[PDB]
UniProtKB/Swiss-Prot annotation, chains A, B:
Molecular functions per Gene Ontology: DNA binding
Species assigned in the record: Caulobacter vibrioides (strain NA1000 / CB15N)
Top-rank taxon, per record: Bacteria
Protein name: UPF0335 protein CCNA_03428
Part of the whole protein covered: 8 to 72 of 89
Family that this chain belongs to: Belongs to the UPF0335 family.
Disulfide bond positions: none
Amino acid sequence: HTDVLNSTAQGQLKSIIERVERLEVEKAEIMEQIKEVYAEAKGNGFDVKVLKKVVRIRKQDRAKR
Amino acid sequence: HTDVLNSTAQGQLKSIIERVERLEVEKAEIMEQIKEVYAEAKGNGFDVKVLKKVVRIRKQDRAKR
């Protein structure tokens, strides 16, 4: 649904999309590192679900500025 | 609600939480970079909302393996 764009505009749009997708990849890599930290926490004997809840509460109490 | 842990276990739990929060900060920084790319796309004349929809569709069509 983008045939209205000429070749230059198509190039700019392709560039935007490729860059966003690359940053999404970086984002996923950080999220996987978070998963690994939570895995280690589980090895430590902690409840990952409760830990995530704890981390969310601390964001909120920090957000309540 | 963690008084049952001794000082060593408390230290390990504090470490887990601090590391997760640090990775959350990195995550937010990447998300802000994504916001900047979408801002540039808007400057280019594109509809950020539609672009996000396009990027989500490409994830899904990639996810449909």
